[PDB]
Amino acid sequence: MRAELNQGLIDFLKASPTPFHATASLARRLEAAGYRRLDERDAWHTETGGRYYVTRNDSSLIAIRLGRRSPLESGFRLVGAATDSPCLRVKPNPEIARNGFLQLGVEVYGGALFAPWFDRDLSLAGRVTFRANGKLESRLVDFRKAIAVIPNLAIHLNRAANEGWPINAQNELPPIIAQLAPGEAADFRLLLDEQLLREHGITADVVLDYELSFYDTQSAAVVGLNDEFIAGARLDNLLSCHAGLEALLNAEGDENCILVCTDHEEVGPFLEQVLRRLLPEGDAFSRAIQRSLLVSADNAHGVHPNYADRHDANHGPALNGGPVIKINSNQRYATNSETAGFFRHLCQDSEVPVQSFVTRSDMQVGVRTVDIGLPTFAMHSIRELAGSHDLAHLVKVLGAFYASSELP
Amino acid sequence: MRAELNQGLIDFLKASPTPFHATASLARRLEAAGYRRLDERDAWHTETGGRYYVTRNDSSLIAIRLGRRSPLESGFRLVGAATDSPCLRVKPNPEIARNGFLQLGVEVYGGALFAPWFDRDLSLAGRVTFRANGKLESRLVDFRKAIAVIPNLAIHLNRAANEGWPINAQNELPPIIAQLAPGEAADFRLLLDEQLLREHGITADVVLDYELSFYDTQSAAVVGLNDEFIAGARLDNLLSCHAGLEALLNAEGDENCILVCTDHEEVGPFLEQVLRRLLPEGDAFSRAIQRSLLVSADNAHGVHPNYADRHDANHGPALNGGPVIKINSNQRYATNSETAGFFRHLCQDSEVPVQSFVTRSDMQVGVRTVDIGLPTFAMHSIRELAGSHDLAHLVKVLGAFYASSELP
Amino acid sequence: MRAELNQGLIDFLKASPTPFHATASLARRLEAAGYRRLDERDAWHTETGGRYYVTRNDSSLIAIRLGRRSPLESGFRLVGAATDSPCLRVKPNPEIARNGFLQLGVEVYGGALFAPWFDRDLSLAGRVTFRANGKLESRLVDFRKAIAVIPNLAIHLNRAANEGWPINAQNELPPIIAQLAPGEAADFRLLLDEQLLREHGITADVVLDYELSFYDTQSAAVVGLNDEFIAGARLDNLLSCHAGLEALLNAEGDENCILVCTDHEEVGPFLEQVLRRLLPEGDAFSRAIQRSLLVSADNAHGVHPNYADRHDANHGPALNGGPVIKINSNQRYATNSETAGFFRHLCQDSEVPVQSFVTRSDMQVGVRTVDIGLPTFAMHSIRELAGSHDLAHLVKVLGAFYASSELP
Ligand SMILES: [Zn+2]
Ligand SMILES: [Zn+2]
Ligand SMILES: [Zn+2]
Structure with missing residues (x-):
């Protein structure tokens, strides 16, 4: 009865054939759960238990859940995904x-x-x-x-x-x-x-x-002798949008929570302009940002048994093996020992298995980030494959991350 | 309401995932229409209005409709297709x-x-x-x-x-x-x-x-803005099996009629041994064969607008343009001016459009044969494309061929 | 040492430097065993216990062991091998x-x-x-x-x-x-x-x-530290003729048995023309053949330890691991689920070990057939290698097949 998360992913995919449709689907879910649409052209009057969302170009969406303490004191818990494919x-x-x-x-x-x-x-x-x-x-x-x-x-x-x-x-x-x-x-x-x-x-x-x-x-669908897999277009990256949404709507606690689903990830100001509008002028933004963390969710490559040498022998994530922490020392504001450690521990504490990826070696808001993703095959095909167990793992850990009252 | 031939083709395809299943499906249809299974191990007692079928290896099928005159005097009308893909x-x-x-x-x-x-x-x-x-x-x-x-x-x-x-x-x-x-x-x-x-x-x-x-x-399916197409696996050559069956079961007249659907077309004795068993010993076989014709049905290549130079400019058949007579001077017992003329005329008489194919020039029972096929794209893909109009054209002309009391 | 036992094979190779000599050697044994030479030019009179052989071009041979029941009732058990190399x-x-x-x-x-x-x-x-x-x-x-x-x-x-x-x-x-x-x-x-x-x-x-x-x-010789192998010219395919002949002479039971050793296998009328003469006219031939089975024996390739990657990792036959069932879906009248199944059970029942081969995927009378072979190295060399236990395994199964009253 992660059968239900998987059914929900399938329906979300069917209702989201383009980034615009993905955005309208996310907006329906949010509107049905009590989130209020803010309009960027207007002055905003937000408050401490407030539930909001905003869109740009009808293809990007940010959902906001303000908690009891202000972002100045407690930071934001942010989850990033993308609406395009x-x-x-x-x-x-x-x-x-x-x-x-x-x-x-x-x-x-x-x-x-x-x-x-x-x-x-x-x-x-x-x-x-x-x-x-x-x-x-x-x-x-x-x-x-x-x-x-x-x-x-x-x-x-x-x-x-x-x-x-x-x-x-x-x-x-x-x-x-x-x-x-x-x-x-x-x-x-x-x-x-x-x-x-x-x-x-x-x-x-x-x-x-x-x-x-x-x-x-x-349609997307469960495939495998024992239903181990999901096949579908647009898993990159509607898989992560769906997870992030399910986690946002269901998370406990009363922390400041953000889900960012941006267009054009496949081809920054939006997120920034939105976050600044939730805080006073001056040092509050920079201070809230230094207490925040972004979990940037974007599918990872499982090791494919017909192309196994395309992966590093020691870093072949498995489908249904859990979310993968993505390491690339050649990026700034990417996974680092602190953001990775935090996230790995969060998984351990939630009893969610967790994996690591780097590549074979022969192949701006200023927020601390960890880059994670569920493992998949055939990325950028018209029909990709993920594990049927992994969506529930990610939803749980992302729930704990949004409920998590202390960050590193 | 060639909507019905097309629905029937779709169901036949779904029920025929392998040559064995195609054979069992054809046998159900025949059994339901009153055809009797003959067993090759037994002596046969056939007769003049008789309706029969026989299988070998459960993957090849020959259906027989004996008419009023014997094959010695009137020949056989034979249609060939294949059960494999x-x-x-x-x-x-x-x-x-x-x-x-x-x-x-x-x-x-x-x-x-x-x-x-x-x-x-x-x-x-x-x-x-x-x-x-x-x-x-x-x-x-x-x-x-x-x-x-x-x-x-x-x-x-x-x-x-x-x-x-x-x-x-x-x-x-x-x-x-x-x-x-x-x-x-x-x-x-x-x-x-x-x-x-x-x-x-x-x-x-x-x-x-x-x-x-x-x-x-x-499943196979009708596709196109205006439903001009059918997409599906195994069109090569279950498309022709279905046509030949529909024509056989529905044809008028009382001629001697044969449908041969053989396995292993993709990788002769069967047909021969069967036909000989329907006739006396001696010169009767050779004489009946010289009054017979085989319409050998096997999909043709439509000219593909993204690869149009792969065809001869003057011989690009169109989907929904009708059956295609296939000419290759470099075969014996293939289309010739007589078997082609017969078949072309048969189409004209039935008001069925008909087309011609040869290739670009830079690229045994002894029965007179014409090689025809419906035009298609993507032959040997897991999902091929045919025209939605063409199955009805072929069924009509094949019906007229089986009802046709004089051959060239 | 010993043991050997392959002496019959060695002596048969020594006496058979050409297809003519192979045929004369098979003929002399058949004659000494009481088989009567039929001349194809003459009318033939055969009888229920009869033992016959027939040659053509002095280089092909067919031996016939008629049993209690006619081929119409009980089929033929055929073994096929070849006289040339x-x-x-x-x-x-x-x-x-x-x-x-x-x-x-x-x-x-x-x-x-x-x-x-x-x-x-x-x-x-x-x-x-x-x-x-x-x-x-x-x-x-x-x-x-x-x-x-x-x-x-x-x-x-x-x-x-x-x-x-x-x-x-x-x-x-x-x-x-x-x-x-x-x-x-x-x-x-x-x-x-x-x-x-x-x-x-x-x-x-x-x-x-x-x-x-x-x-x-x-001369061919037994080689290896424990006499594991036989090295000799013309193992392809005199190894199979020899095994076929041994099985035919020693087979128990009273079934209709054929051994066919043809010239020019290294690149079907003889066999058909002979079998037809063992039967009445009319439907008898085709009914007898639908009860028959052909074991088509031709050496297979063992996985060679210095060139192992030329085989499929899962279908590497071992020398001395017994007869190989050869699978290639790209032929008609070759091994299929029924002919493989029959032969496999027959091996299990005779306590003969049995193996399967297909190649790497990157490399007539209409009788049911199973293609089998003993495993060897260096096929087509002047000196090939087989396993010294494999002859007996083959002879034992071919014998059980010739005795086998119940076919599929
Ligand atoms: Zn992507
Ligand atoms: Zn084909
Ligand atoms: Zn050879």
């Missing part, structure tokens, strides 16, 4: 008409693995910006249905397929969405127009621009 | 235990594209041979559940991923099915033992050998 | 005279390893066809004596020898047989005439053509 995005003048098809040109967002996007039943979702009633508006759309596919070329016509080839993103990625009669005109913006109507019944004067991503229509 | 098969001593996992070693069956098998939710099915009650038996098993996955290595640990690499089948294909405690023993045959019990409640003395294939648990 | 054959106009030598030009028959043929004491044998007393005649000859050598080049004149070089079969394989005075004429046909007279007391008017193979005069 590497994917394929529709270009601005996208219509491609060849060999009787309609295709949409795509931009590669983040460091996607290309090959797995092929031969998948894809749909399309995101923000559309348009003019209605002489004013500018945006809405989210999700076609939902499998409207697109990027087919492989038959091995018969590419006989060295398995020997590998540099996949050209410009040429081989544009998905097929339909057939066109000769020579029907193709207007993608008209299709968005229809979709706005069908989904929200709005009648746009003109559709201006959009940020739309393809995504797999096949 | 390229896939991954479990090796005989398969258990691999590394980094805390259980994996099963795999053999590559046919010319599979490797990359698409990665990051898919896979299950396992096939024949298991065993000893129960002092006698040798076989049964089909299908675990059904997604018990296995072949994960990609993260792009972070293989940064040139997209530039391509020769995928090593021995090393990179073995699927993960479970986690093992150190050092639980792993017995795959015990797992088959449990599965026999769970699925058929049989208690084997010993499990001897098996022929088991992994397969995608994600 | 890779070797060097003399060309039709072979005399090469250079630097004072007579050499004979050779052609490479089969996939021979070239290097082992060097620096060996070779003799020559096979079929000579000639004309005497106005009739066409053929006889076998065997010079016996070491009359030929293919010497290496001194390392001093080829200092990078051990780095390897592509051996050119046309220039480096021709064997040296003698020295020629200036400018003595060489006539190879005259030498054959002498050898025909010596061996058969016959004088040819003219020697026309021949099929002659070089072979090693060094």
Whole structure:
């Protein structure tokens, strides 16, 4: 009955096909749990048992739980995750008409693995910006249905397929969405127009621009003979968003708690401007920050039994082995002996197994940070694999971290 | 309401994860339509309005519809397709235990594209041979559940991923099915033992050998903005089996009709031995054969708009453009001007659009044959794409071919 | 020491330098055992207890042991093996005279390893066809004596020898047989005439053509500290013929048994044409074959300790660990779950150890078949290696199979 955390992750993933949808999903959960939306344009009146959230660009979210003592005296407990994932995005003048098809040109967002996007039943979702009633508006759309596919070329016509080839993103990625009669005109913006109507019944004067991503229509799922795994797109990093949320809503204590889920992690001012607004002027920010810690959550690489030499022999985390503390001496404000020690101890105290990762050696707010993540395979594929046990481990330790009244 | 042929193809695909399952599915349909199973070990007593089928190795099937005139006088109308597909098969001593996992070693069956098998939710099915009650038996098993996955290595640990690499089948294909405690023993045959019990409640003395294939648990489906496509594994060549069956069961007339669906097309005596048993001794076979024609059905390559130069400019068949007559002057008993002309005319007469294919030029019973197929993309992927209109076109023309009382 | 027991195998190899001699040796044993030679030119009358054999081109052989019940009722038990091996054959106009030598030009028959043929004491044998007393005649000859050598080049004149070089079969394989005075004429046909007279007391008017193979005069031998191995030329595949013959002569029971030893396995009508003559016309043949099984015996590869990575870690057969069941899903009428299962149980039941092989994944009559072989090293060398216990294991199982009244 971490069956429930896992079911919740699956539903969150299905409701979050783009960073915008992930943000709106997080906002629903928070609104249902009593968090008040603050608007950055307004002056804020916050207080000591207060429960708040704020968004920017409708794609980034910070949730705030103010406790009994002020951040000056007790610091903030912060958990960081991200709302974006590497994917394929529709270009601005996208219509491609060849060999009787309609295709949409795509931009590669983040460091996607290309090959797995092929031969998948894809749909399309995101923000559309348009003019209605002489004013500018945006809405989210999700076609939902499998409207697109990027087919492989038959091995018969590419006989060295398995020997590998540099996949050209410009040429081989544009998905097929339909057939066109000769020579029907193709207007993608008209299709968005229809979709706005069908989904929200709005009648746009003109559709201006959009940020739309393809995504797999096949749901995340528990896989394995004995259900040891979860497979799904966007585990990087919606897995961590979900954990951080579950921990935030359920944590005990009365500490000052922050969940930051930022867009564009795959491509700082937001967090800073928000935290400063919760404190007096002067030395209070710097002083509260020096009593704070950030648990920066972002999936780690499990050691893959078919590519085991890609890991250091002594640092191969296992799926269902718990969260992984990520060490890289070549970063500032990364894991250090103090932030790692704190976090490792926190796991021991909660009886949550915990692991370590560094790489093979041949391969700003100023807050103390520990970098952790759940171990996974196939990072940046359209379908990643995590352990089915690990989400409950992370939720527990993050709960203890938010309830934790003393920091190092 | 070719919506119905397409729904039927989807269900046939779901019920046919291996050539054995495809064969048992075809046999159910035939048995329900009144066809009698003949057994090759017995003497046969066949007759003029008779409806029969026969199987070999439980993986190949021939269905026979004898008409009013004998094959000596009117020939046979034969349609050929295949029950197998390229896939991954479990090796005989398969258990691999590394980094805390259980994996099963795999053999590559046919010319599979490797990359698409990665990051898919896979299950396992096939024949298991065993000893129960002092006698040798076989049964089909299908675990059904997604018990296995072949994960990609993260792009972070293989940064040139997209530039391509020769995928090593021995090393990179073995699927993960479970986690093992150190050092639980792993017995795959015990797992088959449990599965026999769970699925058929049989208690084997010993499990001897098996022929088991992994397969995608994600169902075939209609995809496209306007439903122009079907995506699914095993379209090569269960698409043609289904068409040939639907045509056989529904065709008018009273001609001698044969559907041959053979195993191992991907890796002759069967068909021959069967046909000879339907005729007297002497010159009757050779004479009936010279009045017969075989429509050998096997998917063709549509021209792919992202790889259009892989086709000859003048011979790019289109999805939903109808069946494709396949010309290759470098084969004997392949399409020729007579068998092609016949078939093209048959399409014209039935108002079924029809197309032609040859390749770019830089790339035995003795029966007259025409080679046709529906156009598709991604042949030998784990998920292929066909047109949603084409199955109805093929079923109609094949119906007319079986009802057709004069051959060239 | 002892023990050995492989003496039968050694003597059979010694007597069988070519496929013709292999056939004559099998024929003489069969005759002495009371098997009657059928001539394919004549009408045949066979009877329920009958013992027969038949040859073709004097180089293939089929032995037949008819049992109590007809093949229609009880099937055939067939064992298949082959009479040929890779070797060097003399060309039709072979005399090469250079630097004072007579050499004979050779052609490479089969996939021979070239290097082992060097620096060996070779003799020559096979079929000579000639004309005497106005009739066409053929006889076998065997010079016996070491009359030929293919010497290496001194390392001093080829200092990078051990780095390897592509051996050119046309220039480096021709064997040296003698020295020629200036400018003595060489006539190879005259030498054959002498050898025909010596061996058969016959004088040819003219020697026309021949099929002659070089072979090693060094007898097969048991080798190793505890006599673990047998070293000899032509273990592929005379090892299987011998085991097949031993099993056929000594088998108990009253089943229909076939032994098929064919020429040209090193790259099906004979067998079918013969089996059809053992049956009535009509459906009998096909019904008898659907009750039959073929054990197709051809040496397998043991995992070699100096080149272990050429095998799958899990499917490395051991010399002296018994018969190997060879699995390759990429064939029709090859080992399958039923034919493997049957054979495996038969081994367990005869207390014969049994093994499985598939390769690394990165490397007719329509009878059910199981492909098996004894494990060996150095296949296709002039001197191969097998295990000295493995013959008995094979003979015991083939015997149980020939006795085995209950087939699948
Ligand atoms: Zn990422
Ligand atoms: Zn195919
Ligand atoms: Zn060989």
